């Protein structure tokens, strides 16, 4: 609040500051534009999905193990194990802090749906309706995309899944 | 009407507009202080011999 | 035909840059009528009821205020132009990559699979009309990674093995068009006990009958 | 004290002249029907429902408002539908048709050249 | 869009190596991308023509 930061309670100050024109209206407009842009930043990064997708109750993904990055059902926030690690590492004279439009429960719920879309449908949900495919076969499609022949995946499935699991 | 005045128009389009401020009001003025004290004689400053 | 209706009946990003510039130019002129702590806002009023030694002090109070206001105007225009510049730099990349080419980047030239793009000029900008392909009306089938036959493992050359319940075909992955599995649309590598999920089925050789 | 901005929520004068009022981060017991407390302040003139829709007018902290059920109401926005992929270790879905779609994208390239 | 909803061929846009797939995680005021890539290993030399 420009007027409350400058003058601040006093009344001899407000009539004198009234003589400067619209200097304080400009500053409030400038700060309000910034605050409206911060919600559009987050909407553009995270709300990139039509539906809220869910993973099936089994976890038969060809030997691949996604448990450290899928949501944790025993929590109020329902974050994953790595999202819990990341969140533990990071009134005045007219000053105020507004809250974001999206809670970070909502943000964690957008991210888990993006994850379940990928693990279950590959890249089809990003271009239309989600079309299920088994995870080993999707991994073999992706090996083709980098120019490796797709039996190199099926004949090395266990080793490839172990390497993924250790790197995670 | 306060929104129409803030925008300087007679037609407001859908949205949400900051229009003013709410500030609780304070009543009475409590002046606290300490106990002990004397009349503090100036009668040895202005009336010295 | 529907673009034409939806527009004839949305250009808010172009309207906002016009509005911002006009709102700033009006605030600049509306400052020519503030005192900033002087007796009036008119120089013909300080030069008419004050002698030159007293009008200097009152003219300087106006000069300082008006300089401040002009320089605020010029800073906010630099900051707004740096943002218009990035938008035009993105428009120049989309004209190269969506209009003079076919893009493979996901969600860069529409939503779907990019086919082609058409430009149209607008008052202070450009409209792209993106034409994309969207798949529709899906069915489920059952799949296998490979087919075992004669002790060998066969993989599709460019498709997927599918089953309608009792028979095994090859399709291409984005459009359903089943074909008989032959040695012309599959290739062989290895024996059929290392892949997990192999199914047993016959792979048809075209020469073997025809020759005989 | 409890100082704070005041915002006015309107469906648009071409729809109605009813209005709701947000007292930003003020406890709703010291404002001076429907009084509703939000993580973003005290809302007056909208009723709180239990449904969840797509966001219309953003209030904050997950709460949006709409002119639906009239008057003004509060609630928690909707992230989106709910799609459940029938994933299995040997099932695939393949499309049998397509649609040709065309969309627009609008971009500013210039602004007005002014001199002083 | 390009590393989570698809597979990228742009070099170094989604990590070091040949991009296989990417997973997002939310951070406070930010995002974390876990990029899975393929890295070749244990080469032999040969004669060629
Ligand atoms: C996925 O990986 C996790 C490891 O991050 C597995 O959970 C651990 O499993 C070991 C034994 O395999 C236990 O000693 C740990 O206590 C487990 N950690 C937990 C439960 O937090 C998990 O079992 C793997 N998933 C599958 C299906 O094997
Ligand atoms: C210095 O002494 C004189 C003499 O008493 C003080 O004058 C008295 O002032 C009070 C208040 O003005 C009167 O009620 C008395 O009648 C005055 N006395 C006489 C005799 O006239 C004077 O106040 C003393 N100076 C100071 C600073 O206290
Ligand atoms: C693919 O098959 C699955 C398996 O039945 C279908 O998904 C089920 O559909 C029924 C009816 O719509 C639902 O009640 C189930 O909840 C779904 N999921 C299951 C059973 O896991 C799906 O409809 C089929 N897809 C197509 C395109 O036919
Ligand atoms: C799977 O597709 C095959 C098509 O090759 C179907 O089998 C044929 O069906 C037609 C019409 O019913 C018959 O005239 C043929 O004799 C069948 N056999 C062959 C070798 O062509 C089969 O019915 C389909 N199965 C299901 C469950 O739809
Ligand atoms: C796929 O075909 C092979 C060969 O026809 C089957 O292998 C035979 O399986 C039976 C029953 O388990 C054994 O008695 C034979 O000794 C096997 N022969 C060989 C050469 O391995 C195989 O079982 C078939 N797979 C399925 C799922 O039926
Ligand atoms: C693929 O979808 C199109 C629609 O996009 C189908 O064509 C429509 O068919 C209905 C019924 O025959 C007609 O009323 C419409 O006029 C057709 N649309 C157009 C644009 O011509 C088509 O039949 C579908 N193909 C398959 C194999 O299902
Ligand atoms: C392939 O052969 C080349 C030589 O033609 C190897 O490079 C030699 O490597 C050794 C050990 O690092 C060096 O001491 C020599 O100086 C290298 N030769 C030259 C001419 O510089 C290379 O390491 C071999 N790579 C593989 C995978 O076998
Ligand atoms: C798929 O899962 C079923 C359990 O229903 C199991 O019997 C079968 O061996 C599995 N096959 C593959 C290829 O994973
Ligand atoms: C605005 O008013 C016009 C005419 O009164 C009407 O046609 C139009 O639908 C109104 N717009 C909205 C959003 O109600
Ligand atoms: C407002 O004040 C009351 C009285 O102390 C308190 O119970 C209530 O929790 C306060 N509001 C909030 C949002 O905490
Ligand atoms: C909304 O649902 C909750 C369930 O806990 C219930 O207690 C509450 O009364 C409901 N609100 C309304 C307005 O019905």
From Swiss-Prot, chain B:
Changing residue 43 to H: In strain: Omicron/BA.2.75, Omicron/XBB.1.5, Omicron/EG.5.1. It comes from the Viruses. Glycans are attached at residues 27, 29, 35, 47. Residues 23-39 are annotated as: Disordered. Attaches the virion to the cell membrane by interacting with host receptor, initiating the infection. The major receptor is host ACE2. When S2/S2' has been cleaved, binding to the receptor triggers direct fusion at the cell membrane. When S2/S2' has not been cleaved, binding to the receptor results in internalization of the virus by endocytosis using host TFRC and GRM2 and leading to fusion of the virion membrane with the host endosomal membrane. Alternatively, may use NRP1/NRP2 and integrin as entry receptors. Binds to host ACE2. RBD also interacts with the N-linked glycan on 'Asn-90' of ACE2. Cleavage of S generates a polybasic C-terminal sequence on S1 that binds to host Neuropilin-1 (NRP1) and Neuropilin-2 (NRP2) receptors. Interacts with host integrin alpha-5/beta-1 (ITGA5:ITGB1) and with ACE2 in complex with integrin alpha-5/beta-1 (ITGA5:ITGB1). May interact via cytoplasmic c-terminus with M protein. May interact (via N-terminus) with host bilirubin and biliverdin, thereby preventing antibody binding to the SARS-CoV-2 spike NTD via an allosteric mechanism. This is Spike protein S1. It comes from Severe acute respiratory syndrome coronavirus 2. The lineage of its organism: Viruses, Riboviria, Orthornavirae, Pisuviricota, Pisoniviricetes. The gene is S.
UniProtKB/Swiss-Prot annotation, chain C:
Changing residue 20 to H: In strain: Omicron/BA.1, Omicron/BA.2, Omicron/BA.2.12.1, Omicron/BA.2.75, Omicron/BA.4, Omicron/BA.5, Omicron/BQ.1.1, Omicron/XBB.1.5, Omicron/EG.5.1. This is Spike protein S2'. Disulfide bonds join 98-109, 148-192. Glycans are attached at residues 140, 164, 200. Residues 15-59 form a coiled coil. Subunit of the fusion protein that is processed upon entry into the host cell. Mediates fusion of the virion and cellular membranes by functioning as a class I viral fusion protein. Contains a viral fusion peptide that is unmasked after S2 cleavage. This cleavage can occur at the cell membrane by host TMPRSS2 or during endocytosis by host CSTL. In either case, this triggers an extensive and irreversible conformational change that leads to fusion of the viral envelope with the cellular cytoplasmic membrane, releasing viral genomic RNA into the host cell cytoplasm. It comes from Severe acute respiratory syndrome coronavirus 2 (2019-nCoV). Residues 1-36 are annotated as: Heptad repeat 1. Changing residue 47 to F: In strain: Omicron/BA.1.
Curated annotation (Swiss-Prot), chain E:
This is Spike protein S2'. The chain holds residues 1030 to 1078 of 1273 of the full protein. Glycans are attached at residue 45. Disulfide bonds join 3-14. It comes from the Viruses. Subunit of the fusion protein that is processed upon entry into the host cell. Mediates fusion of the virion and cellular membranes by functioning as a class I viral fusion protein. Contains a viral fusion peptide that is unmasked after S2 cleavage. This cleavage can occur at the cell membrane by host TMPRSS2 or during endocytosis by host CSTL. In either case, this triggers an extensive and irreversible conformational change that leads to fusion of the viral envelope with the cellular cytoplasmic membrane, releasing viral genomic RNA into the host cell cytoplasm.
């Amino acid at each position: 609040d420009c007027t409350m930061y400058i003058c601040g309670d006093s009344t001899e100050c407000s009539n004198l500051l009234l003589q400067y024109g619209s200097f304080c209206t400009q500053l409030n407009r400038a700060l309000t534009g910034i605050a409206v842009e911060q919600d559009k930043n987050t909407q553009e990064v995270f709300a990139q999905v039509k539906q809220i997708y869910k993973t099936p109750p089994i976890k038969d993904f060809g030997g691949f193990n996604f448990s450290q990055i899928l949501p944790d059902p025993s929590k109020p926030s329902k974050r994953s194990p790595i999202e819990d690690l990341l969140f533990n590492k990071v009134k005045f004279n007219g000053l105020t802090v507004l809250p974001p439009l999206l809670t970070d429960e909502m943000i964690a719920q957008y991210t888990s749906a993006l994850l379940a879309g990928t693990i279950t449908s590959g890249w089809t949900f990003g271009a239309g309706p989600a079309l299920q495919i088994p995870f080993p076969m999707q991994m073999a499609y992706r090996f083709n995309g980098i120019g490796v022949t797709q039996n190199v995946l099926y004949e090395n499935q266990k080793l490839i899944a172990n390497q993924f699991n250790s790197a995670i | 009407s306060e929104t129409k005045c803030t925008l300087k128009s007679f037609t407001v389009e859908k949205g949400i507009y900051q229009t003013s401020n709410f500030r609780v009001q304070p009543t009475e003025s409590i002046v606290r202080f300490p106990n002990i004290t004397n009349l503090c004689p100036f009668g040895e400053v202005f009336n010295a011999t | 035909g529907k673009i034409q209706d939806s527009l004839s009946s949305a250009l808010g990003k172009l309207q906002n840059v016009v509005n911002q510039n006009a709102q700033a130019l009006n605030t600049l002129v509306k400052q020519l009528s503030s005192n900033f702590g002087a007796i009036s806002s008119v120089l013909n009023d300080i030069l008419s009821r004050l002698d030159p030694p007293e009008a200097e002090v009152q003219i300087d109070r106006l000069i300082t205020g008006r300089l401040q206001s002009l320089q605020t105007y010029v800073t906010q225009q630099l900051i707004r132009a740096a943002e218009i510049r990035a938008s035009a730099n993105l428009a120049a990349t989309k004209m190269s990559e969506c209009v003079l080419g076919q893009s493979k980047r996901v969600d860069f030239c529409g939503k779907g699979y990019h086919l082609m793009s058409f430009p149209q000029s607008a008052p202070h900008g450009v409209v792209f009309l993106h034409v994309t392909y969207v798949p529709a009306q899906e069915k489920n089938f059952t799949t296998a990674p490979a087919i075992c036959h004669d002790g060998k493992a066969h993989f599709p050359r460019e498709g997927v093995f599918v089953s309608n319940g009792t028979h095994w075909f090859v399709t291409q992955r984005n459009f359903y068009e089943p074909q008989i599995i032959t040695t012309d649309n599959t290739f062989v590598s290895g024996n059929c006990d290392v892949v997990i999920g192999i199914v047993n089925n016959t792979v048809y050789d075209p020469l073997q009958p025809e020759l005989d | 004290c409890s100082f704070g901005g005041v915002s006015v929520i309107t469906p648009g004068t071409n729809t109605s002249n009813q209005v709701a009022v947000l007292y930003q981060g003020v406890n709703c017991t010291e404002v001076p029907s429907n009084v509703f407390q939000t993580r973003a302040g005290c809302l007056i003139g909208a009723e709180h429902v239990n449904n969840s829709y797509e966001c219309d007018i953003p209030i904050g902290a997950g709460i949006c408002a709409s002119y639906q059920t009239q008057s003004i109401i509060a609630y928690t926005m909707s992230l989106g539908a709910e799609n459940s992929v029938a994933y299995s270790n040997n099932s695939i879905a393949i499309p049998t048709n397509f649609t040709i779609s065309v969309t627009t994208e609008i971009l500013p390239v210039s602004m007005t050249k002014t001199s002083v």
